[PDB]
């Protein structure tokens with residue numbers, strides 16, 4: 004079924020050899036590589052629709068926004084900017100080292116490893132791949148085995164665009180991953196849970212391999228007394244229930260000022276009941292196990308269910324759920340939920356709200372603050388370390404090529420997208436020229 | 439002697455609490471912190487001169503250039519620019535997320551850890567510290583154990599400038615280091631050997647701690663036919679034998695075209711036997727145990743000694759030595775020498791020279807090329823991965839704040855100096871504001 008370790012070693016060796024050919028050095032090569040990836044993605048749209056529907060119940064419109072469209076936009080943006088990015092940057096020379104001409108080169112790493120997660124398998128495998136490509140690297144991709152249909156199409160896309168010595172997909176489970184992690188890769192890009200990130204970095208240490216880790220945690224959505232409540236409910240609906248809550252930058256929990264909680268939940272519960280009435284309205288959880296995990300949490304919570312909490316394990320379905328009266332103590336606040344459940348906590352003092360986030364779940368991937376006072380909103384953001392942040396918005400910062408997407412501490416290290424992907428998949432090389 | 443684990447934990451805990459105060463937020467505080475650092479260094483030069491002469495036999499002018507002057511120049515560069523650096527950067531917003539306003543914030547990591555090497559203990563502890571400071575972090579510094587005198591002065595300099603809740607020195611050995619590496623630091627800066635880099639990274643993995651590793655390797659100095667032999671010998675004399683060859687960016691070995699090898703070696707050997715005649719002309723090796731290691735290598739060499747070889751383990755000294763007729767097989771081409779020995783190898787064409795360096799000792803911290811054909815010299819540099827590179831010069835690239843300094847692969851991960859220190863000691867936080 005999966006490649007044997009021998010064939011994996013052999014595939015790895017052919018990429019090492021291919022890189023040493025310096026085939027990837029010129030920008031003309033890198034640009035046509037992007038054109039071939041783009042073309043291969045477009046050729047396989049319909050297969051991606053079916054694969055993502057089967058694996059995760061993703062609607063076609065979502066796939067076009069968050070999966071296919073996200074990648075194609077990054078590709079087009081990279082193509083229009085690559086000539087600028089690969090150009091040597093000349094710097095001044097101080098007098099102590101004069102006379103000399105100095106400049107900075109962004110130099111490729113070599114053979115790279117991309118580990119793909121289940122939840123947005125196209126976005127989070129192929130967008131970093133763009134990084135590897137424009138940086139002048141080769142790449143081995145291991146998509147998630149828990150989304151088998153889309154992993155197969157990803158392999159088909161890559162096989163169709165590229166020779167395996169340049170870019171290859173290796174499907175596999177635990178055993179194939181630990182084997183690949185033991186190889187002397189030159190760069191490793193991982194997207195997944197904090198505990199597996201620890202495993203990836205530990206393996207990376209043994210070969211001194213630099214890593215980027217895009218991890219998780221619990222993103223708060225904080226609602227100030229002066230927030231536009233319809234706007235807030237809209238973003239909650241979008242952010243919390245897209246892909247059954249299986250999003251790294253999804254609002255994990257709601258942190259609302261006591262004085263607008265009743266009015267907020269009234270709007271929210273009504274819209275959930277109206278727009279998400281079916282048990283599989285949000286999509287599918289990736290595995291039956293995940294549904295059972297979430298059901299146990301619901302069975303253990305001290306909060307009050309306002310809507311939902313209906314589950315069909317065999318369907319991999321859990322209805323959109325809102326749970327009121329939750330404390331930091333609650334089972335729903337122990338771990339990242341990654342499910343269509345929204346626990347609701349209350350605050351009065353903004354200073355205390357800040358402290359509570361920092362104390363219980365610090366450094367999330369994103370902090371969301373909803374309100375009309377920008378000083379108060381920005382002030383909250385500036386006092387909560389997080390990967391990224393938004394005021395009166397959700398998720399869409401990850402779809403901008405101008406913004407460095409990445410976490411801090413337990414939510415990760417390193418950033419990418421746009422120019423930042425290029426800088427992430429190269430190292431800075433100083434050059435000093437003496438006459 | 440050394441602080442107990444209980445007080446180390448107690449010291450670490452206080453920096454966490456102090457960072458949480460947001461004391462380090464405003465740029466004014468950071469600028470004053472550098473001023474206090476600068477004055478503390480200046481007010482202690484004499485003690486540094488003595489300590490460094492005692493530990494390593496460093497001449498006053500070497501200390502003025504590569505130690506005291508190096509961090510003073512960085513401090514002044516940082517002070518002159520920091521106001522511009524800390525200002526949030528507004529970025530474009532694509533139409534897909536309109537309407538919104540977006541910007542990037544460079545946000546401090548928190549409590550950082552700086553491990554100092556023996557060979558340049560002032561430069562490679564205080565220059566990273568500058569980054570820690572201007573990043574808005576706190577810092578715990580552990581200087582090398584093997585240079586008692588200077589480490590003691592560093593502690594004095596740091597205590598003079600800073601309260602221990604902000605920046606603190608903790609002297610110690612392997613046991614103190616492994617205990618510090620077990621604490622939940624928010625960032626670790628390491629300078630040292632590759633094998634210890636693995637230890638540091640493996641420990642950082644357990645807390646998802648981002649690292650920068652400034653490591654080792656064997657920097658080649660490659661000599662083309664039309665090179666200036668006078669220039670070449672001057673730079674070798676300067677680069678190879680400064681601090682007894684205990685320099686990370688020193689030319690470890692000489693790699694010279696066959697047609698000029700004899701002429702170059704006549705010029706080089708004559709200069710060595712006259713300018714470096716005594717057993718301790720180059721200075722002191724760090725330990726007696728090091729001397730013994732170097733001598734043993736000379737015993738096993740298949741190459742012909744041309745000068746020096748004489749050594750005195752008792753006074754931590756070894757004579758400037760040039761070894762001719764060396765192949766990659768040789769016991770002198772196995773490890774990083776880090777001593778007063780210059781092995782000399784030879785090649786028949788540029789093509790073979792490039793391929794042999796990449797084959798036997800790839801990714802060194804620096805590649806040096808001497809010749810007057812720039813297209814050829816650059817051509818070599820472009821085909822050998824390395825942290826940094828020079829044509830017709832050595833070492834001085836590390837003394838320009840406009841140049842990022844750092845390795846690749848075995849020579850390390852990450853860069854610093856100048857603006858790059860600010861960027862390394864912070865993370866990029868995207869912020870999107872929706873009306």
Ligand SMILES: NC(=O)c1ccc[n+]([C@@H]2O[C@H](COP(=O)([O-])OP(=O)(O)OC[C@H]3O[C@@H](n4cnc5c(N)ncnc54)[C@H](OP(=O)(O)O)[C@@H]3O)[C@@H](O)[C@H]2O)c1
Pocket residue numbers: 118119120121122123127145146147148149175176177180181194195196197199200202216217218219220250251339341368410414415
């Ligand atoms: N910052 C971001 O960009 C981002 C994006 C999406 C998700 N996330 C985070 O990812 C997590 C959820 O996604 P996930 O369930 O796919 O994370 P995951 O469990 O860490 O899996 C990620 C990848 O690593 C493999 N894997 C899982 N457990 C492993 C283990 N003990 N040892 C070795 N490999 C292992 C997986 O293989 P298989 O799946 O094939 O078994 C998968 O390919 C959440 O924490 C989320 O916040 C972050």
Ligand SMILES: NC(=O)c1ccc[n+]([C@@H]2O[C@H](COP(=O)([O-])OP(=O)(O)OC[C@H]3O[C@@H](n4cnc5c(N)ncnc54)[C@H](OP(=O)(O)O)[C@@H]3O)[C@@H](O)[C@H]2O)c1
Pocket residue numbers: 553554555556557562580581582583584610611612615616629630631632634635637651652653654655685686687774803844845850
């Ligand atoms: N890229 C750069 O910035 C740069 C510049 C110059 C030199 N270097 C590198 O520095 C290296 C040599 O210096 P060094 O001997 O001081 O490096 P080192 O042996 O790796 O030690 C560096 C630090 O780690 C501690 N340490 C050493 N060995 C250890 C072990 N086995 N376990 C745990 N901790 C350990 C040391 O404490 P104690 O020393 O107090 O015992 C010291 O503070 C060379 O490889 C050179 O290439 C790098």
